[PDB]
Design a protein around this ligand. Structure first.
Ligand SMILES: *[C@@H]1O[C@H](CO)[C@@H](O[C@@H]2O[C@H](CO)[C@@H](O[C@@H]3O[C@H](CO[C@H]4O[C@H](CO)[C@@H](O)[C@H](O)[C@@H]4O)[C@@H](O)[C@H](O[C@H]4O[C@H](CO)[C@@H](O)[C@H](O)[C@@H]4O)[C@@H]3O)[C@H](O)[C@H]2NC(C)=O)[C@H](O)[C@H]1NC(C)=O
Ligand SMILES: *[C@@H]1O[C@H](CO)[C@@H](O[C@@H]2O[C@H](CO)[C@@H](O[C@@H]3O[C@H](CO[C@H]4O[C@H](CO)[C@@H](O)[C@H](O)[C@@H]4O)[C@@H](O)[C@H](O[C@H]4O[C@H](CO)[C@@H](O)[C@H](O)[C@@H]4O)[C@@H]3O)[C@H](O)[C@H]2NC(C)=O)[C@H](O)[C@H]1NC(C)=O
Ligand SMILES: *[C@@H]1O[C@H](CO)[C@@H](O[C@@H]2O[C@H](CO)[C@@H](O[C@@H]3O[C@H](CO[C@H]4O[C@H](CO)[C@@H](O)[C@H](O)[C@@H]4O)[C@@H](O)[C@H](O[C@H]4O[C@H](CO)[C@@H](O)[C@H](O)[C@@H]4O)[C@@H]3O)[C@H](O)[C@H]2NC(C)=O)[C@H](O)[C@H]1NC(C)=O
Ligand SMILES: *[C@@H]1O[C@H](CO)[C@@H](O[C@@H]2O[C@H](CO)[C@@H](O[C@@H]3O[C@H](CO[C@H]4O[C@H](CO)[C@@H](O)[C@H](O)[C@@H]4O)[C@@H](O)[C@H](O[C@H]4O[C@H](CO)[C@@H](O)[C@H](O)[C@@H]4O)[C@@H]3O)[C@H](O)[C@H]2NC(C)=O)[C@H](O)[C@H]1NC(C)=O
Ligand SMILES: CCCCCCCC(=O)OC[C@H](COP(=O)(O)O[C@@H]1[C@H](O)[C@H](O)[C@@H](OP(=O)(O)O)[C@H](OP(=O)(O)O)[C@H]1O)OC(=O)CCCCCCC
Ligand SMILES: CCCCCCCC(=O)OC[C@H](COP(=O)(O)O[C@@H]1[C@H](O)[C@H](O)[C@@H](OP(=O)(O)O)[C@H](OP(=O)(O)O)[C@H]1O)OC(=O)CCCCCCC
Ligand SMILES: *[C@@H]1O[C@H](CO)[C@@H](O[C@@H]2O[C@H](CO)[C@@H](O)[C@H](O)[C@H]2NC(C)=O)[C@H](O)[C@H]1NC(C)=O
Lengths: 330, 343, 330, 343, 330
């Protein structure tokens, strides 16, 4: 152990963390690969998702070349504070941390040719602007932006180490509400007035699972709307029966609508689900108004015709509304 | 690489970071600009908002001049904490985060002239007091003020790097608001006096306007259609007492369900807003419709309605004939007065 | 800056932070003033309030006297760790912190005579016991107790710098739920077995706003109760109308109480609002039970007397209940 | 000042803070007492309670004897961390807080004899396992256990400074409980064996009794009156089918509204509490009242009621007449059994 | 006492914490046992659970052997920063910390031969992907994966100390919603791109308590379903009575359905509770829909036959649905 101990002390002695590898020479190429552990949460209210991953950085530093040891030195995580590491950050990251139990979840692995592998276990909440107009039939594209903070492409370059295979573990992701449809790796240079800055982007496309809203939201609303049509098959003189049915469906629809507002998130603008609930509320509102016109045109002043035509138009117009709705959203 | 290493060591030789530049000699002039990456969510309940910024400060420190092959030096996060930087803070901040993942998201650059550019990536929660009397048709100018915590204007003065309008820049995709529209911003500066002295304050106001389409479809339209529905009862015959009692009472219950849920969205404030008054009027209209029928029923004589063929029958209530016009009209007038006032 | 650098280093040379000013001598007098920035939250459930403020402390330290500079020396906030500061703490604070962006929101300002100004920007959640029996018509008295953790009045003495002008910013405080009616400053020496300890108390009297509760709780409850009286004006033979009116009002009243039970806080004991809601529930319960007496006497076993008397007693007794309620709670 | 300063610098000369007093020589005895400034809120959902305390620890360390003018020394916060202190922890603690405003809320004193008095101000969240079968008529003993994490009883033993009843002191204005009454406490000590050896555990149980008045006016009274109201249908004439059907079905909906709301107040447990059974039985009663009318209506022969001046009419059901007695009596009996069992 | 102080100084003089014992030699064997103090939260919303445990690690470090002291040296936990400890972490944890009041809940105990006992008190939130198809009749299996972060199986090996007795305290655990049916200890190796790593797994089997849901969720749904059949025993001509009963039970079912779901997160796939609640919703929907045919086929055109069969088919079909449901999920 003494030989390796003196080997390591040799490396750090005279090391300058303030200078990048190949300082003043060609830019240092840093390869990156990510092993995704999980996407714990995806919140529409905050418009962000929580991601756990193993974030690996891979580059070459000639100052760390060691000879005589035919092994790849896996060192304690505390040695990472004494080496140079890239100033990588996540552009859209709202809050993040490195796990610290039992020790800090950090890894440093050296190789004889001076190649450094640097891994971190990170949980990060990354900002994801979402277009929830088609919610719950929406498809989201949430990204992770990787950039250098204070270096340009004259000093540091980024690439996905392994091409399109640089990211693995996507099949491990188990989101109850979404399914990972696709993921992409993008490497690009961002040019500002101050220069060009390396950029890596990891993006996922999420498709929301609709089955819950079919059973929980759409089917009850469809069944209540159908139930409101039972009025059309009752006698015009059954005022107590037809008003109680019509007004209680309105109350039932409001109960469904108002209480659904509580289980569903606080997204304060019109979405696809809002338009369907508002569509069904108008239909049940009109069914109650339909009997009032029948009741008034009889006692205040044909009658069988209005009920006959309502028995067809209301189911037909609701089917047409659904056809226009699902085509415009599916 | 030796030349670069030597310059760094020589810079901090005798440098005292406890003393501002020109202490006792002149006034330190700090030039600031902000780049808003994302104007985060606004919380009406907490009366605060989040903003993600690149906070750039620029000032001159003659003690950090240098000469060498390069003209710009990048200082390590450890080096930045070794020198004097402005003790800038946000007056209305509630809890702010200087991101430290994976490394500190700071950057200190020094030019040979002695000018320092100092940028940091921040997430700031700021206090935005709101007057919610016009809610949901309210507009707010959420402020963002900063200055020196300890240095008076006789010691440190802040200025915008360029024309105040162009010194604060919002990224094109930076609007992360759900219920607001970022109309624009006004950038100002001034002096604020407190118990410890006069301080310079740089202020930026973001003018927000609440989107109303949500509350129109969630609150206003259901309330309007229930009030109309409660008035639809006026067109039923006066002899259907069970039907018109069920009709009127369940519309009161519908208003109660709507009113309860409508106030859940509102922040828990103890005063009345523009939506509370609208609901209170709708409550009074729905209440009066059931009181209207109670008066009609008092003057009903025969318990049977018109048979439809022809024995005498009740006449259409004169209360009903008037209420079919007065109730819609009064609600119609109220809506015009209500909407013209707040819109 | 050459002369100033020598002077500042001179003061801290040999400085012993562990010893108070005039150690082993007369007690050090610490003047305090507070500039309140905001009272963010006041939660009945947790029985606490959140207060952001600028907390200044003034004391004289002859070890820090300097001459020849006609300037008040503001020093980098990190020098505070090198000086002696009072061991001040907030006796009823639950969670508190000093703001730290961009740097620590802390201030040290020296004066030629030796006066030290030590200011902090603190957000503290302070415990406030609340008597909510008269809720929502309650007035609360929340306090902030300032004490020395270790020292006694033989060593350190507190006072409000500027008398009643010590605390500022109260008039500009806006609370969504309360209004600041008054504030008081108290200086006292708490006494225990060990001895006398310095104490400063800042207290506010909060008077809850009633506008929300009038429109949301009292008005709907009054109107539902008045609506339940409509049954007294309906014919005894209209059993379907009077029962439907009576039981739906009972349902509405429970809907109000159960749905406003979740919007209102979890304060689990009988408050003034509970009594009024409970009282209205009894009145609507009795109005429906009144018809049961009416129906039974006619069909089972005069008839107009029970209704005629109810058309007066119920409005009258509700007025009497209201008179007693408002006089007792106002 | 010089005399005071010299003692501090001399104290830690040759002092090893990694070794407990009397290591390998005897058992370190620690005398402890608590002054509860406020018994904070108790959370049924989280099965935890908050408590603000001045945790005072006392022990003897011969290595810290001193001689001088003063008989007590107040160590600095930095000094307190340089010397050996007991590694006391709370066995059932969840997330405790040591207050650090404005300075560390700690104080360490040393007497000439070497006795150290060590106090700190803590906000402790602690585990209080609750058996909620009798909720809301339940009582609990929330414990507070502490001891040495690393040192077995052969090394460190704890004791109370004075009589156990007088060692835990609650401030007179300390009870900050909304749903409980702090009846008192019992103070004990014992031994616990684990995989690493036997340790001394100091325990304190706070006996709490839940206030029932809130649940009587919120849950029990509305549920009792709703059940009573369901039985009020038995006194209506059998010919009013729509009125007694609406009466019975809407009382079921009222019980459902009350029953659902009652659970939302309950902590998320998955066993039947006392209040669950009362609501379930009330539900059965209200359910049986509507089933009773289903039977009564099944034997009604004439759709018209008695005309008031007597053509034959239906008699009053014997099912109704017997239900006017059986239903109130069975519910009354159920209330005696329920209330006697739990009170 | 100084003799012990001198001994400890010798051990740490020249000690290299970045290098594991027997670096380059045989892998260091690390034995682990756990004492579970409590399981606090098991949340479906976050799909995790909280665990408070005493976590012990045993390994042999020849550099820490000592002689002449016939005692096991329990040392101040701050010495752990001066020793090599395994880079152990919890592979599925979301957020965890080591308790630190009054001091860090950390233990270091040495033994004469060089054995090291490293104990920690840890509260860890661990990811447990739960299968909620059979909820609330579901049985879960939650694991705790213990793996080395940086070191491969060539450097560090894990084993359960004491076999199946390595975990204690499970019998004492009380969960408000689950019962610990069983627990298992597994040991295996996991192979990644960077090499094989040692793995220790601890898993529990959780069975949910069903009695509560029977009274809260299933029983009211059963009773309302039976109530909807009261309509089949009412005269065909009681339109007001039968519609009011029919639509209010539909409203009652929605009330049950609307805010039951707030007891669980918005998790979109079909569950056992959803099928039953929607099964009962369809029945009450059909009971009211059945009267539309009853009323129409008399006034609009075998009235008793339709009512007669529903008095049998609806109770029979619901029992058949219940039989199939309970057998399938039990
Ligand atoms: C979520 O939404 C984001 C956008 O907000 C999507 O990100 C975009 O992804 C596409 C790929 O699907 C990107 O397009 C590609 O960009 C590459 C990088 O461009 C830089 O470098 C090239 C030179 O190599 C410069 O010309 C350019 O100005 C940039 O500096 C290009 O290399 C790609 O070109 C490839 O295809 C074209 C043909 O289409 C060939 O001609 C080329 O030779 C080459 O093979 C391509 O243009 C796009 O830039 C991304 N935008 C952003 C803002 O990142 C995510 O894909 C989306 N998520 C999902 C899951 O779809
Ligand atoms: C990016 O920013 C994050 C925070 O946002 C940093 O994480 C913190 O880093 C600091 C500095 O290393 C850590 O502070 C350390 O605290 C140790 C004691 O912690 C115990 O007690 C606290 C409560 O007081 C508990 O919360 C904690 O769990 C422990 O129980 C000290 O022992 C450390 O001092 C040691 O190192 C210093 C180095 O200079 C030496 O001088 C000391 O002698 C000693 O050896 C240290 O003070 C803090 O704990 C970290 N927080 C978390 C949550 O991990 C990152 O470090 C930062 N990144 C960079 C690159 O700066
Ligand atoms: C919220 O509730 C708190 C109590 O919980 C109230 O605090 C009390 O406020 C009143 C004033 O409103 C205080 O009464 C005054 O106290 C002064 C200080 O007393 C201390 O010092 C004197 C010696 O100077 C000692 O004797 C005494 O024991 C205390 O140590 C007195 O100087 C005042 O005296 C005035 O009245 C007396 C007659 O009562 C006259 O003889 C005097 O000349 C003089 O006019 C007075 O007694 C009271 O002490 C406070 N109590 C506590 C515990 O602090 C808050 O006021 C309340 N909040 C609001 C907004 O009302
Ligand atoms: C919750 O769910 C987890 C899975 O996620 C379950 O964990 C599994 O538990 C089973 C046992 O019930 C495990 O099966 C056993 O694995 C042992 C270890 O296998 C590793 O090591 C051996 C060498 O020792 C390698 O050959 C192998 O590839 C693995 O790397 C085996 O030793 C066991 O073998 C048994 O049968 C063979 C004959 O086939 C005998 O020769 C053996 O002596 C022995 O009797 C066995 O195969 C399985 O590995 C676990 N999976 C994981 C991923 O850990 C939990 O059980 C479950 N919880 C509950 C409470 O049910
Ligand atoms: C909030 C509502 C307050 C309502 C207060 C209402 C206050 C009030 O007193 O109303 C009663 C009266 C209407 O009485 P209404 O027409 O309902 O009653 C008729 C009246 O009693 C006739 O005298 C009867 O004829 P007769 O005796 O046999 O010859 C007739 O019998 P029949 O024809 O049925 O056989 C009854 O129907 O109202 C107004 O005239 C103006 C109402 C303005 C209402 C303005 C509302 C904005
Ligand atoms: C939940 C309870 C369910 C009980 C189900 C009980 C089912 C059961 O057995 O019902 C039969 C009978 C019905 O009694 P009820 O009085 O309702 O029925 C009368 C009976 O049918 C007479 O024969 C009729 O007169 P008649 O034929 O023209 O001469 C009379 O009509 P009318 O003269 O009025 O026009 C009917 O009203 O009930 C009992 O005896 C009470 C049993 C104990 C009841 C105990 C209740 C606790
Ligand atoms: C130090 O720890 C060892 C165990 O690591 C103790 O050895 C145990 O001693 C008890 C004495 O009754 C025996 O019953 C056990 O069988 C022993 N276990 C082993 C693994 O040897 C030892 O006693 C401890 N030191 C002292 C002074 O007791």
């Amino acid at each position: 152990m003494s030989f390796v101990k003196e080997t390591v002390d040799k490396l750090l002695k005279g090391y300058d963390i303030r200078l990048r590898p190949d300082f003043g020479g060609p830019p240092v190429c840093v390869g990156m690969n990510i092993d995704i552990a999980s996407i714990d949460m995806v919140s529409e209210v905050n418009m962000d998702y929580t991601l756990t991953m193993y974030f690996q950085q891979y580059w070459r530093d000639k100052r760390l070349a060691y000879s005589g040891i035919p092994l790849n030195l896996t060192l304690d995580n505390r040695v990472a504070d004494q080496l140079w590491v890239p100033d990588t950050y996540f552009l859209n990251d709202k809050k993040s941390f490195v796990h610290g139990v039992t020790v800090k979840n950090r890894m440093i692995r050296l190789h004889p040719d001076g190649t450094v592998l640097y891994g971190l276990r990170i949980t990060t909440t990354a900002a994801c602007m979402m277009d929830l107009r088609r919610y719950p039939l929406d498809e989201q594209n949430c990204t992770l932006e990787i950039e250098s903070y204070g270096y340009t492409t004259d000093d540091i370059e980024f690439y996905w180490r392994g091409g399109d295979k640089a990211v693995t573990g996507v099949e491990r992701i188990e989101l109850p509400q979404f399914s990972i449809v696709e993921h992409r790796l993008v490497s690009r240079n961002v040019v500002f007035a101050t220069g060009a800055y390396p950029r890596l982007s990891l993006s996922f496309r999420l498709k929301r699972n609709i089955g819950y809203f079919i059973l929980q939201t759409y089917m009850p609303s469809i069944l209540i709307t159908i139930l409101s049509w039972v009025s059309f098959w009752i006698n015009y003189d059954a005022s107590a029966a037809r008003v109680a049915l019509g007004i209680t469906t309105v109350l039932t629809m409001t109960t469904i609508n108002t209480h659904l507002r509580e289980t569903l998130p606080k997204i304060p603008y019109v979405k696809a689900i809002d338009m369907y609930l508002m569509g069904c509320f108008v239909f049940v509102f009109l069914a109650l108004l339909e009997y009032a016109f029948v009741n008034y045109i009889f006692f205040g002043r044909d009658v069988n015709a209005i009920d006959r035509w309502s028995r067809i138009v209301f189911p037909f117009t609701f089917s047409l509304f659904n056809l226009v709705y699902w085509l415009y959203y599916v | 690489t030796t030349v670069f290493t030597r310059i760094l060591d020589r810079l901090l030789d005798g440098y005292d970071n406890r003393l501002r530049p020109g202490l006792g000699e002149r006034v330190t002039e700090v030039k600031t600009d902000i780049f808003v990456t994302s104007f985060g969510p606004v919380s009406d309940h907490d009366m605060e908002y989040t903003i993600d910024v690149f906070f750039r400060q620029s000032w001159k420190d003659e003690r950090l001049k240098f000469k060498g092959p390069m003209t710009v030096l990048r200082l390590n996060n450890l080096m930045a904490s070794k020198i004097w930087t402005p003790d800038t803070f946000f007056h209305n901040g509630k809890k702010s985060v200087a991101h430290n993942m994976t490394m500190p998201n700071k950057l200190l650059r020094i030019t040979e002239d002695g000018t320092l550019l100092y940028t940091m990536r921040l997430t700031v929660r700021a206090e935005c007091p709101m007057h919610l009397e016009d809610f949901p048709m309210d507009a707010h100018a959420c402020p963002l003020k900063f200055g020196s915590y300890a240095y008076t204007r006789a010691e440190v003065v802040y200025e915008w790097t360029r024309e105040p309008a162009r010194s604060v820049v919002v990224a094109e995709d930076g609007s992360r608001l759900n219920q607001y529209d970022l109309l624009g911003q006004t950038v100002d500066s001034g002096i604020v006096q407190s118990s410890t002295g006069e301080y310079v304050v740089m202020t930026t106001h973001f003018h927000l306007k609440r989107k109303i389409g949500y509350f129109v479809i969630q609150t206003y339209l259901p309330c309007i259609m229930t009030v109309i529905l409660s008035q639809v009862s006026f067109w039923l015959n006066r002899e259907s007492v069970p039907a018109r009692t069920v009709f009127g009472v369940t519309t009161v219950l519908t208003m109660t369900t709507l009113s309860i849920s409508a106030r859940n969205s509102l922040p828990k404030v103890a005063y009345a807003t523009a939506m509370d008054w609208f609901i209170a009027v709708c409550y009074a209209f729905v209440f009066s419709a059931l009181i209207e029928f109670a008066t009609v029923n008092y003057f009903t004589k025969r318990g049977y309605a018109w048979d439809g063929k022809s024995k005498t029958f009740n006449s259409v209530s004169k209360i009903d004939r008037l209420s079919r016009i007065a109730f819609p009209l009064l609600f119609g007038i109220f809506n015009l007065v209500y909407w013209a006032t707040y819109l």
